[PDB]
Write a protein that binds this DNA or RNA. Sequence first.
RNA 1: AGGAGGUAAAAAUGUUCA
RNA 2: GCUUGAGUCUCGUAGAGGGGGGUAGAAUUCCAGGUGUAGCGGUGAAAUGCGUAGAGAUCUGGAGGAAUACCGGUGGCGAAGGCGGCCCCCUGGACGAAGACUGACGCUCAGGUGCGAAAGCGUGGGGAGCAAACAGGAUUAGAUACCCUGGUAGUCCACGCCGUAAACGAUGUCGACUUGGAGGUUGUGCCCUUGAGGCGUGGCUUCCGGAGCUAACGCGUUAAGUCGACCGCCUGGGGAGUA
Lengths: 65, 65, 271, 88, 100, 116
Amino acid sequence: IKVRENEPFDVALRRFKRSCEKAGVLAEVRRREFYEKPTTERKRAKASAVKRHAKKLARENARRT
Amino acid sequence: FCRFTAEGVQEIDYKDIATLKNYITESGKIVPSRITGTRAKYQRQLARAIKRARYLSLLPYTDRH
Amino acid sequence: AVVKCKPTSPGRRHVVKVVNPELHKGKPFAPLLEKNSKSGGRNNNGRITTRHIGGGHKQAYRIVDFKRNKDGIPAVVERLEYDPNRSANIALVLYKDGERRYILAPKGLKAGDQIQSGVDAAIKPGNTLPMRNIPVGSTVHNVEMKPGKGGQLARSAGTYVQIVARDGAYVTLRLRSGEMRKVEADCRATLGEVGNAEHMLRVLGKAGAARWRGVRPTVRGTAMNPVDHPHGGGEGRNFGKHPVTPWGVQTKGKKTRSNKRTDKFIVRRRS
Amino acid sequence: SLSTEATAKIVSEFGRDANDTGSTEVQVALLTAQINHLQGHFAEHKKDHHSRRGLLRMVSQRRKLLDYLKRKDVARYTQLIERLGLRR
Amino acid sequence: MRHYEIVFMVHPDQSEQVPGMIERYTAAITGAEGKIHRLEDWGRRQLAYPINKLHKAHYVLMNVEAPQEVIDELETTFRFNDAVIRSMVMRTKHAVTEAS
Amino acid sequence: RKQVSDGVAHIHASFNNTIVTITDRQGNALGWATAGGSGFRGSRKSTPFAAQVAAERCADAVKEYGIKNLEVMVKGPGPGRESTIRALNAAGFRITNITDVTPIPHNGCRPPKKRR
RNA sequence: AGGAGGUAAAAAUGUUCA
RNA sequence: GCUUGAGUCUCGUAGAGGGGGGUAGAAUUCCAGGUGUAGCGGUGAAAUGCGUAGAGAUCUGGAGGAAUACCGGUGGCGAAGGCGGCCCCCUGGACGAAGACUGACGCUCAGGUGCGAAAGCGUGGGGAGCAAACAGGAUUAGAUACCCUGGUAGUCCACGCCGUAAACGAUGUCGACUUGGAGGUUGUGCCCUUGAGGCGUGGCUUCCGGAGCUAACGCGUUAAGUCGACCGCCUGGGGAGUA
């Protein structure tokens, strides 16, 4: 949260910001309450994730690349 | 990738802030099991301890005091 | 508890009785009683100053101890009595040295509960102690306004005040009306809310029910003639004027608070 | 809740010995002790519907066992009921 | 009887008067057959965040083994005592006598 | 004047504006500048370049106080947030440390449902 | 390979039958 | 009478299971004061609104009500509805372990009883945020809509009522049997903990798939497969789940 580096930085390099929250959750409580949509995007989240890894273990057709 | 008391049987303690700080990020947030490789069972005991330690102010609710 | 009567008669149709199956049924304690003649709203000059007051059932005044002077002496609740002069129930209490006194009945109080007053006392419903020994955020009632005065605020049925701040020698209390007022921390207070909190659910049902409470018919201004009320007049229900009292002072929204010497004690006005 | 020592009495009170606890008389006596114990929990609270389902489950379990005992041997049944104060 | 591990932070100023509190509580406890396990006083350490102002509070662990009617008076004493700040109790799980 | 030495820059970078306020260490404000104050009205108001001139116009107007070095505590998402700290550093101020104080609640209130 | 920030104000209607 | 049905006792296990009473931090609004100064807010753009009576921004303190970030995961528990900060008290159920015990007490179940999201209703409180209705500003051919500024009921609490949802794996309940694979989650036994373990034995559950089945899609040991027991329900569309 508090990046300093103290003396030889001369630049931001605040990687923690893109690595903790500061965009995800802030632009999440931005609006829309839903109360239920989280659940459907919860299941759709891994529905896409599990089908990607299912074909990751099944990409060996040939494709001739 | 790394394990814990699952093999070396023992219980998590809210008082032991030596090891409890190793399971939370410096910004006062609990780290998910997908990264620490912690067993789901102990993560729950871990989380209960972190929340108890925060009440006893042995841990930060957030680094921004 | 509340019991809606069965409509076996017009007038008994809408009656809702607040019955308490544990109040003493016999006669009150004689030594702590004195007569109380009604006035009818009339004063020294014999004129009716306040209207709609008169008639009603005869009621004897029960000397209720609000001051709470007995300190360091434990007492036990003998029984719960009915007080016609008040909105809440009163509890006959017997002291350790053989002195009986009537005190307001707090919420959770049964015959046999032990209470006491003084700076020594603990924190329990019924105990009376100075407000500087009471934890901020507590719920008290029968609060004194001046040290040794007696107890003015929150003494009606189901009422209570709340301590919101204790800055220095002044306790900031949030009154029932929603008004925050500063009171010196040496004024005593009794823990808990006042009993008979179902009093508000009581529905009289009859016009006569109001008559024996001591209330009389209230005639509206529109029904009167110009010489009787600032409203009056009208050949067939005409109003057209501005809502005022029978004495011309604009009612329905005009503040009459003018003390100036007690404005120092008021933090946030009622709203 | 009837912990280990509380139930320890009832099994030895209605059974032939401290080992025989599976007997029908022992069970019904146990459920009765649990029900009367739970009347206080439902005396107040009045809104614990989830646990009340647990209560009503053992209420019917008692009834199913009582009817069994009556049909199997009415003699022991007539001894049991007045001993526990039930059966309207 | 149940086991408890009652903890309580106490005001820094009253820290010089904390021993009086520790033995006063145990008096009422052991008076009610409350066998004790620990008494791990951690001292006056730094706090994580401001608790009603004034950092670095004073921690005291008790770990008591007593019946429910004993500790209920204890919680009420914690509520009505401005010396102690933020006190909490926990369940059993076989009271310990170690771990500093 | 009073001549202060160290201060802290508060950058409130929200979705529409990026109001920058330079205060002292105690919190008392000295000078401030906004993207919407230096012209840039409308769509150009919610732009990182507008945040640049916001920092420049706040770089000055605090000259009478003469702040040597200052800290940066940014707040809100905003389109600026990182382009505004650049113009504030390249302006001639010594940046000691940068912190992020975005006020995220722990499910405090019910946010709007708006935007269909 | 792994996760996020950003990407459209407005555009109505079409006789029955083959 | 016996035991593989079913139930009980002993010891433990995980858990947003349910009820009651306290408590914590972040954040929003509001109130007072200090610093400070022309915007702020909003949008596709703009305006209403807020502001030179000095807002916004910022700092300190205080008052409140509601929801509990991270943990949190096609994870867990519950009959279903549904339930997550923490703590204590009262309390239900499921599951495993090695034995004993009772001895068909079992399954289903019209009528009946109970529980039953949200909205809504009655009584009394509470009221920050959000927000029907409503108002204004825009957009538009019109806009009593979408968007914006505000905003009442309501949303929250106690006690009663209503009894309805795409109350949905759209799949009634119980029991038996019928090739496998890959994971999660929760017990336990055995072997060397010889090192982030290995092989079995149960509960629950996610995904993929064979036989078979199906109109097809697909389901696929938690079956829509192969059978048995009982209950509910359907008989072309509309009229109408209405009179």
